Amino acid sequence: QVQFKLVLVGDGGTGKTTFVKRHLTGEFEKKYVATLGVEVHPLVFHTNRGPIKFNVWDTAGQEKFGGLRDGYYIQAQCAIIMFDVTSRVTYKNVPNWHRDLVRVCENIPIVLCGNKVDIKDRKVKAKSIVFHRKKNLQYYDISAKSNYNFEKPFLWLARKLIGDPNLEFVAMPALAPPE
């Protein structure tokens, strides 16, 4: 079994749980139910090199969970930092998310994601997203609503942790169903 620990961080309301759920079942949860501490969810992908699993640590974004998530971060091999392209405060808080990650695990591959690009008018324009440039992180515009780039964070991280930059997601083998 080949797997990785992934901590998912970002302000409350950014779409972390929604993103995880979308991968997990296909659903798009309209409601906002704040995550209580952390939810650990397995996500399996298939590739030209075999099955891989991300053990995703879906952490709550509220400040009060600051002390606990330092414990969540121990042994994390990668992370996604989520922000909301609809809420300027959430891009403004990104540097603190990065700082919080790097002070517990130094040189781990990290993706910055600007969720919610489906909404017609961004409050955070493309040209204001620059943090990934100063910290040499991988960036993606994403949307848990429209699936836009929604596989990318996992592929890119998969490529880095596995050590194969040409790694490709392949079709999940279709086992024979019930009867």
């Binding site: 080949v2 990785f4 991968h23 079942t25 296909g26 659903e27 798009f28 992908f45 298939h46 030209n48 090199r49 075999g50 091999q77 040189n107 781990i108 591959p109 040499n136 699936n147 929604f150 596989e151 996992f154 880095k160 942790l161 596995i162 050590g163 194969d164 997601f169 392949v170 079709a171 999940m172 083998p173 279709a174 086992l175 024979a176 169903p177 019930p178 009867e179």
Partner: protein, 139 residues
Amino acid sequence: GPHFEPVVPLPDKIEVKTGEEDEEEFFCNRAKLFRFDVESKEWKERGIGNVKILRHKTSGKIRLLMRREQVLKICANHYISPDMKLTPNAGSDRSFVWHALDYADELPKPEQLAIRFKTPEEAALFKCKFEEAQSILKA
């Protein structure tokens, strides 16, 4: 750009195995799939990608198969039964609903499913092939 150390022994490339090499396609088309949540009593999205109706070349069994695009996870996998009924949505000629014992999560789950196509032409070919698949069994 920058380089990271891989945290795992780099596994060998494997031959691409779909699970479908023993079947032939009757129907292949992209669609949007929904699954009704019994508890909340609402439709939930299940996936977007290609629906396929496949017949096993030896057993003659016919199933429905759907993979989510980009991530390529299965979001529907069940044998078509003569007992199944495709029921158009009120006022909609782009969608149908049916019940199935589905194996997408690799676990047998009864589900009611909705499938929507972009053009009513795409839907009609699905109905047609779906129901034609059902022409087997008996006589």
